[PDB]
Design an enzyme around this catalytic site. Sequence first.
Site, short mmCIF file in Angstrom:
data_model
loop_
_atom_site.label_atom_id
_atom_site.label_comp_id
_atom_site.label_asym_id
_atom_site.label_seq_id
_atom_site.Cartn_x
_atom_site.Cartn_y
_atom_site.Cartn_z
N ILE A 46 52.35 35.46 -50.39
CA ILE A 46 51.69 35.91 -50.22
C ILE A 46 51.81 36.52 -48.44
O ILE A 46 51.33 35.59 -47.46
CB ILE A 46 50.15 34.83 -49.86
CG1 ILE A 46 49.12 35.31 -49.78
CG2 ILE A 46 50.41 33.21 -49.21
CD1 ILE A 46 47.71 34.27 -50.21
N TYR A 47 51.61 37.76 -48.05
CA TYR A 47 51.53 37.66 -47.33
C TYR A 47 50.54 39.57 -46.53
O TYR A 47 50.02 40.29 -47.37
CB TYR A 47 53.30 38.68 -47.01
CG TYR A 47 53.90 37.45 -46.48
CD1 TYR A 47 54.50 36.51 -45.48
CD2 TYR A 47 54.84 37.46 -47.96
CE1 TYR A 47 55.18 35.42 -45.59
CE2 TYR A 47 55.60 36.02 -48.03
CZ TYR A 47 55.78 35.46 -46.60
OH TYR A 47 57.34 33.48 -46.46
N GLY A 53 44.32 38.32 -46.29
CA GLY A 53 44.58 37.38 -47.17
C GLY A 53 44.14 36.82 -48.12
O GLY A 53 43.81 36.53 -48.55
N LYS A 83 41.19 25.57 -45.54
CA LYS A 83 39.47 26.43 -45.71
C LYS A 83 39.52 26.50 -47.60
O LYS A 83 38.42 26.52 -48.15
CB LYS A 83 38.86 27.30 -45.01
CG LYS A 83 39.42 28.89 -45.54
CD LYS A 83 39.89 30.28 -44.20
CE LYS A 83 40.06 31.54 -44.74
NZ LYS A 83 39.98 32.58 -43.81
N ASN A 126 54.42 26.57 -39.83
CA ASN A 126 52.89 27.90 -40.10
C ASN A 126 51.26 27.11 -39.89
O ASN A 126 51.14 26.93 -41.10
CB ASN A 126 53.06 28.65 -40.98
CG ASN A 126 52.93 30.15 -41.22
OD1 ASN A 126 51.95 29.48 -40.08
ND2 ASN A 126 52.42 30.88 -42.54
N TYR A 163 44.80 27.76 -45.71
CA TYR A 163 45.13 26.98 -47.04
C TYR A 163 43.95 26.66 -47.18
O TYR A 163 43.57 25.68 -48.37
CB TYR A 163 46.43 26.70 -47.28
CG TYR A 163 47.46 27.85 -47.90
CD1 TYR A 163 46.79 29.54 -48.42
CD2 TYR A 163 48.16 27.52 -46.38
CE1 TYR A 163 48.41 29.61 -48.10
CE2 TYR A 163 49.56 28.73 -47.06
CZ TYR A 163 49.42 29.71 -47.92
OH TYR A 163 50.44 30.86 -47.78
N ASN A 172 48.65 28.07 -38.25
CA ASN A 172 47.78 29.11 -39.07
C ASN A 172 47.81 29.12 -40.48
O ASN A 172 46.45 29.07 -40.92
CB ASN A 172 47.97 30.02 -38.42
CG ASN A 172 47.62 30.41 -37.16
OD1 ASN A 172 49.13 30.26 -35.96
ND2 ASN A 172 46.73 30.32 -36.71
N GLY A 187 40.59 39.59 -42.73
CA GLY A 187 40.33 39.27 -44.60
C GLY A 187 41.16 39.84 -45.44
O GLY A 187 40.57 39.92 -47.11
#
Length: 174
Positions: free
Chosen positions: A99-100, A111, A147, A138, A145, A140, A109
């Site tokens: 997922i990039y 991602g 949230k 990572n 994830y 960030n 928004g």
Amino acid sequence: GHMMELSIKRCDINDLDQLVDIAIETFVDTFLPNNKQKDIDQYVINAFKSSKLMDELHNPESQFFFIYSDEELAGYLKVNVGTAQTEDMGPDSFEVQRIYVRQKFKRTGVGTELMTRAIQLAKRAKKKQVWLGVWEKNVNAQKFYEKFGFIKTGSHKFLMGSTPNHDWIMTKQL
């Protein structure tokens, strides 16, 4: 252009060249801050080879998605179920393997849209949890994830060249 909404597409083999390009670009951007380019190159030369991604595009238990921002490619997503999961989490699990978001579209928004769609797909597939590996450096992504209700449930070594990296396993049940 006048298209403010993001749009999702399922990749097919005519997207291979574009998939290879964005897979490399975003992987390097993510890992170059704390990994040598030499080590990143050895990972890329095996994982993102054209013939390699072609076969993954032909795996029906996997799916690649492109997300577009005003008709420009902004990111991509790869999900696995069943035997296509990189770890044997079982028939009730759903892996987000890739997922990039491209650099120029970060913090808009993109991602969140991809992950929201990944969870929708898992629900439609009647899966009971979504899981993924995130590099322990990572932070960030970890907060991203978190949230969504993902929680660290384990670890898994991630070899990049000769350098052993350590992924967290994060899981969201539902």
